[PDB]
Design a binder for this molecule. Structure first.
Ligand SMILES: [Zn+2]
Ligand SMILES: [Zn+2]
Ligand SMILES: [Zn+2]
Ligand SMILES: [Zn+2]
Lengths: 413, 413
């Protein structure tokens, strides 16, 4: 009743993810990563990928229940290293220049109750093992896309007051479809014009080349430097083959990397965060000389401290992203407990790695150059959100001039 | 409605699969193959495996719709070889001595309009690539179990007289639960009673040590030599580590290997066969001096020839199994289009590999020794059903005496 024409819209969504998200070309290999619960969507994705000429789709199926049992019951020795066959699966994808479509539908609290040290050692072992792919991906060597599907446990958390499970799920798909423009009569046109409006804010920032940004809101007073020759990006990338693609659907942000060596001040998080299958609440961070010097959370405090102080590069920032508080996901009043959505509802920062493309010619830079360019290197990249309708930001020019950028959570003018 | 207490019985089934099918032990690795459509059962299986002390469950998810798309649309070079990463995965299972629980719920006609040459090439290359696994399982190096779950497309073919798709699946679940003794107050004891009965029979044929078997029925007059020191087996097996396990659930057969060098005459199949995701009908096979000299089918003729002429050892048999016509599955009158079910409703023969345990001490024999002893070495093993209410079978003794074994499809004297 809340979601009429479901099957048709779902097929319309699948088509979008494949034609416009990844942009499948003849001869391509597609890796789809997706939850078993979402087989219906997976079938539609795979059909469309072959209809557009893919030579091969490989589906890597995930499942929260089974992943939780592994974490809960396997010994550390199965959890703290990556077996060779998984590395060999990754290399086959790399070898084939596989596009990577990731459809997220997991329970935000999927791994609640798992020992802290196993989540942490598994994420470290994987972050190190999967690095070649992250590197290839963070530099648009292949098309990649992150998108969502309405998992049942996720939907119950997003809408705890739903009249029933089905209603919770309908409401989530409805948000997915609306933010991905699936209801538009011409979604491609609509995506093109959404893209244009963000691209023009990004161009305006690329021209200013601010030296730093200063954020202010209650619980927040933070100054972040920006690298020399940084690129603000949004909605739309071009891969190392001339092909256009959408890295995130939905998306409402314009973003770049700060200079990882320059951060002072403090910041209060305004959204929860799902990290390692746990929900983290009430995060606060203090920065000094470019480094995290204290990190705290009302729930999940130990998860954050372990993120930050036990992975290299994680005491520094790799992304700063702007989203107007009046934009549609922020305005829906929904908290998603999910990074792809909540990050497109609110300004956000990332702990850990900078995308290579956040600096000019960054996609052909070595790790050494990227680092010297002021772009943080890390095996983790963990977005947390800091915007609100009370937030002001100024851009700071090279001569210290303060330019209003955001006022009360929206572009200043 | 036609099915009592689904959730509880499904749970009881999964425990049964893990405890008595595979017999999971502390420290074991388990590999589960299961369709994504059966996630509810998979969650139950995985939970009990860890409850029983597994160190790791690795789930190999399978999906008919996506496999068909691949076969319909991928080019030959993605279908006629097995990527190194699948072989790495298999080797990781072998090195860890993984148990193998295969839950089948596949559509019998899953791959219906796929090019025959693609089916044949993909099966041949898999048969070659998976050889070290086939070998280890057929000589009980690890526990393994093949069992079933009620897939929708399968259930529709099985019960076209069903009021609905949902009721079709229900009737299939009811057969699965029925024949695996899930409805009994003590299924373990029911399974021990069942195994004890079939073991009586196999023990008695093992005393006989017939020289050959002679089958007669309307499309069948086939004589098959039996190896020196053959062993007739049924129900339970025992693995290299001393643990009891059940290879097949359900099961109703007693079986051994014929001598692959001794076969003469012709035989007609009596149930359809699902092979390479195609339904095969009206198979006739002609043997001369141990070898298939011609194989036809009214439907799927080419698929059968490709099986027999393209794979190593596929011109000889490696199994002959007996199941009385009045036995429960056969008596139900239902045609499953499914080997695990149909072969346990009817005498059958397997094209390809003999189990090492079909000759005394075969578990300990080199491949060379197995072949010297008269057990067929092959990269495939494919059962087809030949039994009916009119089949006669004589045992031939070493002094030339014909001893009735079956008359009109049943054990007889
Ligand atoms: Zn971002
Ligand atoms: Zn980010
Ligand atoms: Zn058999
Ligand atoms: Zn067999």
């Amino acid at each position: 009743m809340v979601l009429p024409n479901f099957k048709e819209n779902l097929e319309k969504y699948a088509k979008l993810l494949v034609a416009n998200g990844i942009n499948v070309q003849p001869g391509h290999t597609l890796a789809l990563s997706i939850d078993v619960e979402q087989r219906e969507l997976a079938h539609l994705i795979v059909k469309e990928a072959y209809a557009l000429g893919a030579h091969e789709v490989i589906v890597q199926w995930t499942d929260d229940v089974i992943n939780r049992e592994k974490f809960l019951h396997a010994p550390m020795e199965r959890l703290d290293n990556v077996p060779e066959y998984k590395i060999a699966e990754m290399n086959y994808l790399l070898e084939n220049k596989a596009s990577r479509l990731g459809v997220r539908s997991s329970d935000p609290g999927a791994l609640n109750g798992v020992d802290a040290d196993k989540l942490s050692a598994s994420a470290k072992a994987m972050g190190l093992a999967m690095k070649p792919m992250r590197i290839a991906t963070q530099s648009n060597k292949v098309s990649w896309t992150v998108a969502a599907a309405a998992g049942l446990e996720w939907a119950k958390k997003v809408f705890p007051n739903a009249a029933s499970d089905e209603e919770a799920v309908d409401f989530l798909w409805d948000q997915i479809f609306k933010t991905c423009r699936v209801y538009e009569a011409d979604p491609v046109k609509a995506w093109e014009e959404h893209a244009a409006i963000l691209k023009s804010k990004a161009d305006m920032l690329n021209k200013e080349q601010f030296s730093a940004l200063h954020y202010t809101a209650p619980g927040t007073d933070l100054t972040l430097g920006l690298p020399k020759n940084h690129v603000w990006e949004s909605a739309g990338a071009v891969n190392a083959q001339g092909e256009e693609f959408l890295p995130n659907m939905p998306t409402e942000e314009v973003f770049t990397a700060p200079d990882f060596r320059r951060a002072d001040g403090y910041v209060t998080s305004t959204k929860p965060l799902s990290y390692n299958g746990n929900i983290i609440e009430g995060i606060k961070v203090t920065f000094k000389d470019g480094q995290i010097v204290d990190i705290t959370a009302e729930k999940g405090d130990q998860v954050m401290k372990d993120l930050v102080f036990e992975n290299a590069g994680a005491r520094a920032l790799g992304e700063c992203a702007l989203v107007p508080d009046p934009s549609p996901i922020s305005q829906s009043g929904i908290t998603f407990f999910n990074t792809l959505f909540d990050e497109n509802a609110s300004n956000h920062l990332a702990i850990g790695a900078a995308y290579a493309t956040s600096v000019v010619d960054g996609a052909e830079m070595s790790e050494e150059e990227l680092e010297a360019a002021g772009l943080n290197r890390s095996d983790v990249h963990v977005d947390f959100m800091i915007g609100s309708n009370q937030m002001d930001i100024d851009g700071i020019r090279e001569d210290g001039t303060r330019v209003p950028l955001f006022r009360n959570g929206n572009w200043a003018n």
